[PDB]
Amino acid sequence: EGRVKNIVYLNFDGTITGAHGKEVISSPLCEALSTKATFDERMRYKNEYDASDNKIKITENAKNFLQDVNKLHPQVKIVIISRNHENYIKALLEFENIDHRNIIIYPRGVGNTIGPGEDKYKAVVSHEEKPECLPGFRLICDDDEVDGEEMCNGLIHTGRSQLVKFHNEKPGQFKWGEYFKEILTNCDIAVKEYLN
Ligand SMILES: [Mg+2]
């Protein structure tokens, strides 16, 4: 039930933030936030986040991109695929006042249970196989070229790669403004609703 024709698949660490996941996944702040399952528990960490090295934060341009693309919902959907913890991802979005109500997060699992973001290829294949997903525009951003190809390979495996834009850049080097132009240039109904 529903139609999703245009999907933006985003890695989190090093893509939306300025730090590759290897240098954050085991950090005290990421471990502390991992178990914080409510807004109230997460928000207590905002001060420590704000005092953190700027590399770990959501970058200014990624924040603006997420906020802009959120306004294109439901014509465009955002899917975050990450080996990091769901509650760390939600916390950072909340710290930056980014609404995540409609963003789908495929994160690491809890404990010994494996989560969907631990296998990016399978995460994309599973998402494309949902009955509401239809062919159309695909944007994929990852700072790990291998990971990025894993998500690309998932689109290929499902026959959903006819109109893909794939961006692999070093953290802090993503051209989110250009990617927003790419969405609007390739999603007719998106740009029709955007013009009010
Ligand atoms: Mg990454």
From TrEMBL:
KW RNA-binding (keyword) present: no
Signal peptide residues on this chain, from the entry's feature table: none
Entry GO terms, CC: host cell cytoplasmic vesicle
Positions that bind Mg(2+): 11, 13, 142-143
One function term, GO molecular function aspect: metal ion binding
Keyword Phosphoprotein: no
Keyword terms of this UniProt record: Metal-binding
Protein name: DrrA phosphatidylinositol 4-phosphate binding domain-containing protein
Origin species: Legionella pneumophila subsp. pneumophila (strain Philadelphia 1 / ATCC 33152 / DSM 7513)
